[PDB]
Amino acid sequence: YYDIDDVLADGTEFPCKFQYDIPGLGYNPGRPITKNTKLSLPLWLARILAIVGPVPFVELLPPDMFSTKVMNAIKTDPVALDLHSINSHFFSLAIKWIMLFSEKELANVVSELLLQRAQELNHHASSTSTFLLKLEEMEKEIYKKSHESYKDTKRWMFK
Amino acid sequence: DDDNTEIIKSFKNFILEFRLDSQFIYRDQLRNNILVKNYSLTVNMEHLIGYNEDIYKKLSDEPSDIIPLFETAITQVAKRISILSRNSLPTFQLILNSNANQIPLRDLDSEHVSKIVRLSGIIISTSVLSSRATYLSIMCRNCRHTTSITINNFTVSLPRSCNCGPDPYIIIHESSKFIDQQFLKLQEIPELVPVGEMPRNLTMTCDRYLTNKVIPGTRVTIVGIYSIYNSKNGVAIRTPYIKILGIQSDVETS
Amino acid sequence: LPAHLQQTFSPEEIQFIVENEPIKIFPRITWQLITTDDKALNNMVAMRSTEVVLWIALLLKQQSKCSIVAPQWLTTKELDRKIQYEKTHPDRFSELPWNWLVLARILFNKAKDDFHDPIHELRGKIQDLREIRQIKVLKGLKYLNESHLQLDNLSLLEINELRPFITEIMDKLREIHTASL
Amino acid sequence: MYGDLGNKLVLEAKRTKQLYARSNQDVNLPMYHEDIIRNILKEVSNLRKNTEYLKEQQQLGMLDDKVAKCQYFVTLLCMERNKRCLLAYQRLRTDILDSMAWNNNGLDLMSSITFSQQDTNNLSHQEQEYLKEYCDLITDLKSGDLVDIDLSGSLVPPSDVFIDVRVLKDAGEIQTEYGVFNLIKDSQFFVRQSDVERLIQQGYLQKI
């Protein structure tokens, strides 16, 4: 799609291994790529390779970002967790990977994390410090929008 | 202590009713401070003296007996703002920075002791943090009296009464609330007034939210009270330090 | 291309809206004009109250040719029952004129000398009722779920300030959840 | 490595949004990148060339192999990727642009599109043709109404309704419409909102 956040979200590398052999390597002098080779692929191409096959072309090995250690650590203290370090995209990204693999379990998890950030982001919606530095890019953009509504409504409040 | 009620009522009435046309600068200073979890307040003395001359008349008289009644006075206000009922909320630190008249380092000699003194010097080195106490529980070695001591500022011995004696009181560290402290040590600026002699350095204790606020080597202008501590090294010879409330670095400095 | 804001209203635009609400006035005057949407009036009688739209009252107040009446809900003795009723129902936001913030900004700029005991009082009152109500919104905002919210009785300005936030993270939240079934 | 140049390009696209965001909005886009997108177009031409080559090769050599499909699938995606970049950038460029053509033309008495848009020739002429065609496109909307509009102006509502404008080193007097305001540096005109809207966009007036 046209927005920069999505097309940038597709740019991220995933550890997906090939189910099959594919001569005509476009990545170098294989020429074919031996079966079960683990090659990092951006999301854009890797997205429909898991569908089209009745065995798919790729295994979809779970990304290091989604490692159960992480999905566990985000259940402790999200508010102090640094998202911007790990990817940095999370919600723009994770939203695709939850549909792609059709995982229910973590929905209830991320659906919680994003409330817990936001009950914090209505707190920096009032007129940073260090914290603004650790938000995910898209989340950050929402912070601009909120902070601007508030600032403007305050500047209207007086003269 | 109906007088402390009388003073604190005036401080509440100073925070809630203060108007710079038309926003309430302090009252919003408060909210916007508790939300970021700053737990501090910065009073501008000019507004203060504008509001009542009186409370500044007493605040420049005996600061160290008053200023904590101002702290409790403001935290009793954040109780009615930041939360509502019918925790825990530390008593906020106030940082007051104001113009007045700069009093150079060389010119501090007695006579203004326990009277707020604005001044200017380059910080030498910052001392490593250490905690003082704010609220600590205490039990007796024998009768096991459970006493919650609210220690305030600004040393203070423990009470001996519930043999028993002489001082049978233990500090419970599992429930004790602690704050932080710094110890800046500042050398007055090289431009004035060294003359032919090495410039003196007064030892300063920052605390709570002013701590680690300043990188050593940066020019600053401190405000704070001026006061003396013992520190055996006679007779009697007590040595000088400047408590800081509150610090403001020079432009900008970020 | 509206640029700003654009999805939320502008703080000014909600005043632009509220000024379309009529309120009573005390004209000093004793053409026509039909205008368009007014419907009023036969020549206003001095020392006689009448009902007209706001932006004209404000307009005729700059020229001090009319004295606006104070709203019955704008009083400190009246506000007292309202914060009393608000502290005691931490959940619901009570009963609001829905414009009260913006009328509280507008009628204080000029009309201020018309109010009985306007000084250092009501502003202290509404700056308060605009405090506990705001934190009550931030503590009622933890219960966020898709798709429902009761925001009950809430000012237009209060709606407008937090709108991008709520209706954005609802659009990140509901977006995973609709799509995960 | 395969489609990544587009990720870098949109990464660069992002910074113009950063410059339009807070911001402050003066426009002044650095330049349109013709070079880097030329690289992209040479890369994609490479791609489609190997694509039709292999499309010839399946007809002979590959003989409809199961593997062949992949090349027409994966590499095809890459084409799309470049597209996904190329339009995403481009629309962004039109978004930063048409709005500018909105808020100022410019404004009374437009009366012609000139001296505006500091980018000028530095920005690509391909966009500028679109642009001039676009303001020509909006002249017709100006010509349907009969409001009067003044659609370009008055995004912010009038109050009330007379203001005070303080001259800002402008000469002047160029106020021919309605009346000769007789512009004079260091002169404030207690003038209604009407001609204020029109004259403030130019750069003459300063304090509202």
Add this chain to the structure above:
Amino acid sequence: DAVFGDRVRRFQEFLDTFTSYRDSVRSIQVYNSNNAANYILPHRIIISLDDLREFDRSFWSGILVEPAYFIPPAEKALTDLADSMDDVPHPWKLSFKGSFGAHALSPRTLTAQHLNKLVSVEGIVTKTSLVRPKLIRSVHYAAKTGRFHYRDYTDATTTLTTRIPTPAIYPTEDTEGNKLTTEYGYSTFIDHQRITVQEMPEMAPAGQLPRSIDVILDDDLVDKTKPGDRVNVVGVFKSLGAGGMNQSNSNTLIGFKTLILGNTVYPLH
């Protein structure tokens, strides 16, 4: 203190459902008896914080917020479960893996909001104070009245919680007037040490001097690290000593020196 009982009955349940730890305790109980049949292992059971959140969040937030009231009833519960094991022929220790953190802090950022709360420090360890015994259980033998007589010595770092100090020396002729000889080698000595920890040299902000805080290492943990090693300590953050407020001497603002007890010491590279 029925609530301390509650903490024990609560931590009981956590074990054996799920049973994933119990097999490790059994392994510890078996291996030493295997050494008994032969012809060394520290007794402590590493608890992953990972698992604690699944059962109770209420008890999870507690271990971090107020470890003094929680770690010791959980501990007494662990001994209690180790004694119901097999069979006959010690306090143990908790560990706390994690699932960090909050509480994630380097030593440079700490004090006081992080005090009396579990903490994982990390940095360089220097200079590693020299390993030394520490007395705990007093054991004596009366004669000819016999029996067996023991005192229990409570130091500053005993358990976690503060207690009326027992020390020092020996009772000697506890009533009635019978002679008491010190029985050495039945009586228990836990080794004890402290090691200061400096923040990582590479994350140092400026020419500003490094700030190190001291970590006491109980029992097994002793001699586990040479100085100059990358270390991530864990432990409860303890403030011990009076600030001078106890007695007149001395006169000065300086006070309440702080250190970390325990606990794990995972090395890293």
